Amino acid sequence: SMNPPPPETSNPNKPKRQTNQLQYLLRVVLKTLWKHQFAWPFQQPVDAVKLNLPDYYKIIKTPMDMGTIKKRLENNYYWNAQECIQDFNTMFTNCYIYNKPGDDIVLMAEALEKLFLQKINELPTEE
Ligand SMILES: COc1ccc2c(c1)C(c1ccc(Cl)cc1)=N[C@@H](CC(=O)N1CCC(N(C)C)CC1)c1nnc(C)n1-2
């Protein structure tokens, strides 16, 4: 029933880059999803205490959210685009694992995921 520490957004030991693909993930992909009418449940870690979800972190062992992704992109946490794409996919999958088909929160995740897929289809070739 308590909240865990949030995912890591800072680790000096971890080697970093700023590739053209990572810049597209911030300027196009994250920005498009963040401004959407359905973004709000996904803009910060799940607060299992205030939402009264005492089983959330029993079921979900790899939590992820767009607040964490935004910080990772803005503070240059990643080496490559695949690491960041994996974080978005983990966020959607967690929502579908915890909830039921047709729930409001699932419809919201599906709308954001459709846009994610349309933008990643045009990921530029790495320069
Ligand atoms: C800050 O508010 C949040 C954050 C994360 C959420 C949720 C809400 C919203 C939420 C629900 C409806 C609408 Cl319209 C919008 C959101 N859902 C939660 C899930 C949720 O509360 N329950 C209600 C109680 C249920 N019993 C235990 C069976 C489980 C599902 C959630 N799941 N992933 C994320 C992200 N989320």
Atom of ligand 1 lying closest to residue 99 CA = 30
- CA distances (Å), origin 67, targets 35, 72, 74, 87, 122: 13, 9, 11, 11, 23
Is the CB of 98 within 6 Å of ligand 1?
A: yes
Residue 112 half-sphere exposure toward CB, CA atoms < 13 A = 29
Is the CB of 39 within 6 Å of ligand 1?
A: no
Atom of ligand 1 lying closest to residue 65 CA = 35
Domain range annotation of the chain: 19-123
Is the CB of 46 within 6 Å of ligand 1?
A: yes
Q: Where are the alpha helices (DSSP H) in 5-127?
A: 20-24, 31-34, 56-59, 66-74, 81-98, 104-120
Which method resolved this structure?
A: X-ray
DSSP 40: G
Look up residue 120 and give its two tokens.
């990643």
Q: What is the resolution of this structure in A?
A: 1.2
Look up residue 53 and give its two tokens.
């979800």
For tokens 């503070």, what's the residue? 75
**CATH class, 19-123 region:** mainly alpha
